[PDB]
C-alpha cells in the first residue's frame, strides 16, 4: 500500500508497465488516478491530458479542471490542483505529443514547466522549448492564467474559454487549445474552436490526438 507522488516514483519502485496507477498528493493522504507511460522516452511519465476520440466533454467548470474529469484509460484532464502541487515540489519537464488527421506526429518539450497556485489562477510557467511541433511556443509566453467558461482570466476583452471552448492558458486567445472541440476526419479544418496547436498545424486545424505528460527533469 506504499505511496508515490508521480509516475517516476511508480517506475523507480519497479512498476514498469503502462497503465493507471494511484498517486498521492504531496504532504497529504489524498489520492488521484493518473495514467503512466513507462515506455516513451524511457518512461516515468504522468499523463496530465489526453485527447483521442472526442468521447469526453472538455467544456467544464473551474472546479472540474481543478479536480480532474474523464477517464485515465481514455480522454481526461488530471487536475490543476494536483499538477500545481506536484510541479512546485521539484523541476518537471512538459512533453506534448500530437497527431494530425494525415497520419503525421510531432511533439513539443519544455525544459521547465510549473503551474502557480489556485490563488494565482494556476498560471502556466514554461522554459526551453524543443521539438518538431514548432520553433515558437504554441502556449503563449509569458504564461497566462488558466481560464474556464466560469472563469475569465485571459487577456481578451472576449471570454476565450466561451469562444474557443474548454479550459486553457488563453492569451487573446493565443496559438493553442488542446482542450477545444473534437472534430472528426473531414470536419477538422478552418475550426477556430478546435484542438489547436498553431506552430505545428497553423490556423483553425483541429488535431486527432493529443497527450500532455510530465516527468522530473532529473529522471535518468
Amino acid at each position: 500500500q506504499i505511496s508515490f507522488r508521480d509516475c517516476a516514483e511508480v517506475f523507480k519502485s519497479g512498476h514498469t508497465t503502462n497503465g493507471i496507477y494511484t498517486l498521492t498528493f504531496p504532504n497529504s493522504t489524498e489520492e488521484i488516478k493518473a495514467y503512466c507511460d513507462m515506455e516513451a522516452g524511457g518512461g516515468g511519465w504522468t499523463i496530465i491530458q489526453r485527447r483521442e476520440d472526442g468521447s469526453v466533454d472538455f467544456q467544464r467548470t473551474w472546479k472540474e479542471y481543478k479536480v480532474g474529469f474523464g477517464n485515465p484509460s481514455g480522454e481526461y484532464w488530471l487536475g490543476n490542483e494536483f499538477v500545481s502541487q506536484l510541479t512546485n515540489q521539484q523541476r518537471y519537464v512538459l512533453k506534448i505529443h500530437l497527431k494530425d488527421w494525415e497520419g503525421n506526429e510531432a511533439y513539443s518539450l519544455y525544459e521547465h514547466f510549473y503551474l502557480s497556485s489556485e490563488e494565482l489562477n494556476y498560471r502556466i510557467h514554461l522554459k526551453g522549448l524543443t521539438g518538431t511541433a514548432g520553433k515558437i511556443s504554441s502556449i503563449s509566453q509569458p504564461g497566462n492564467d488558466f481560464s474556464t467558461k466560469d472563469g475569465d482570466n485571459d487577456k481578451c476583452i472576449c471570454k476565450c474559454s466561451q469562444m474557443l471552448t474548454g479550459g486553457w492558458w488563453f492569451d487573446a486567445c493565443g496559438p493553442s487549445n488542446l482542450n477545444g472541440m473534437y472534430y472528426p476526419q473531414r470536419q477538422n479544418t478552418n475550426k477556430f474552436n478546435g484542438i489547436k496547436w498553431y506552430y505545428w498545424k497553423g490556423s483553425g486545424y483541429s488535431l486527432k490526438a493529443t497527450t500532455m505528460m510530465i516527468r522530473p527533469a532529473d529522471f535518468g
Partner: antibody, heavy 120, light 109 residues
Framework: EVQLVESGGGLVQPGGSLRLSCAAS????????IHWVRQAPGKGLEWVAG????????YYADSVKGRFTISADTSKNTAYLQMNSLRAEDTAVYYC?????????????WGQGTLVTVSS | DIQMTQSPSSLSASVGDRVTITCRAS???????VAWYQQKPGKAPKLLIY???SLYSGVPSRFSGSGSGTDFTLTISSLQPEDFATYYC?????????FGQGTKVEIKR
C-alpha cells in the same frame, strides 16, 4: 432593422464638456458591446472606447483615458460617451457601433456619426 | 497594446487590377478577432471581412481576406471605380482596440 442613432454633438470650447448619446433600436444593447470610434479631419479612423452593457466593463484608448467616460443605461437601451477636458484634436465625427461578441465578432452596424468641434 | 501595421499607406491601381493590403500585428492574434472595414468619404465605416477570411453579408465577393498569426491580408481581386476608399484592419481582442493606419485606395484611369 438594426439602427444606432447618435446625438449630442456640436461646438464646445477647449476644456469644455459634452455628452454623446447612442440610441439603439431593433436590438438590446446588453446582448452586444457598444463601441465609439472617431474620425478627425484628414486623419485615420480612431477607436475611442468600448462598453459591455451586461456588466458595465469599460475600455479606452490612451488618447482619451482620464477625460472620457463610456457608460450605458440598459433600461433606456442607450449608451453614452461623457467627454470632459476636451481638446482641439478631439474635433471629429464620432460614430457609435454595435460590436457582436459572438461570430461575426466585429462591428456590423454603425450610427450616422455626430460632429464634435472643439474651438474658442 | 497591440500595434497593427498596415501597408501600403496608399495605392493607385486600374479597374480590373488585383490589389492586396497587408496588416502586421505586433503579437499573435486569434484569426477570429481580425476584421477589415471600408470607409468612403463622409460615410460611416462598413464591415467587409470578419474573422480574417469570412465575407460579411452585403459585401461583393471581389473582397477577400486571408492570413493568421501576425500577418493578415485584404484582397480586391477586380478593382471597381466604386472601390475608391480608405481600408482598415482591426483586432477586437486585446484592449485598446487600435486600428491600422489605413490604406487609401485610388483608382487609376
Amino acid at each position: 432593422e438594426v439602427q444606432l442613432v447618435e446625438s449630442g454633438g456640436g461646438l464646445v470650447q477647449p476644456g469644455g464638456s459634452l455628452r454623446l448619446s447612442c440610441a439603439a433600436s431593433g436590438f438590446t444593447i446588453s446582448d452586444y458591446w457598444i463601441h465609439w470610434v472617431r474620425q478627425a479631419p484628414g486623419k485615420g479612423l480612431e477607436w475611442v472606447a468600448g462598453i459591455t452593457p451586461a456588466g458595465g466593463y469599460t475600455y479606452y484608448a490612451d488618447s482619451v483615458k482620464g477625460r472620457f467616460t463610456i457608460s450605458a443605461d440598459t433600461s433606456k437601451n442607450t449608451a453614452y460617451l461623457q467627454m470632459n477636458s476636451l481638446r482641439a484634436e478631439d474635433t471629429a465625427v464620432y460614430y457609435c457601433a454595435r460590436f457582436v461578441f459572438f461570430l461575426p465578432y466585429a462591428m456590423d452596424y454603425w450610427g450616422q456619426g455626430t460632429l464634435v468641434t472643439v474651438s474658442s | 497594446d497591440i500595434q497593427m501595421t498596415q501597408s501600403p499607406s496608399s495605392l493607385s491601381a486600374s479597374v480590373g487590377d488585383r490589389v492586396t493590403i497587408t496588416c502586421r500585428a505586433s503579437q499573435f492574434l486569434s484569426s477570429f478577432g481580425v476584421a477589415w472595414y471600408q470607409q468612403k468619404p463622409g460615410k460611416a465605416p462598413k464591415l467587409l471581412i470578419y474573422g480574417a477570411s469570412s465575407l460579411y453579408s452585403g459585401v461583393p465577393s471581389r473582397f477577400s481576406g486571408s492570413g493568421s498569426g501576425t500577418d493578415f491580408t485584404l484582397t480586391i481581386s477586380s478593382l471597381q471605380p466604386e472601390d475608391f476608399a480608405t481600408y482598415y484592419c482591426q483586432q477586437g481582442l486585446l484592449s485598446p482596440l487600435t486600428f491600422g493606419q489605413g490604406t487609401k485606395v485610388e483608382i487609376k484611369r
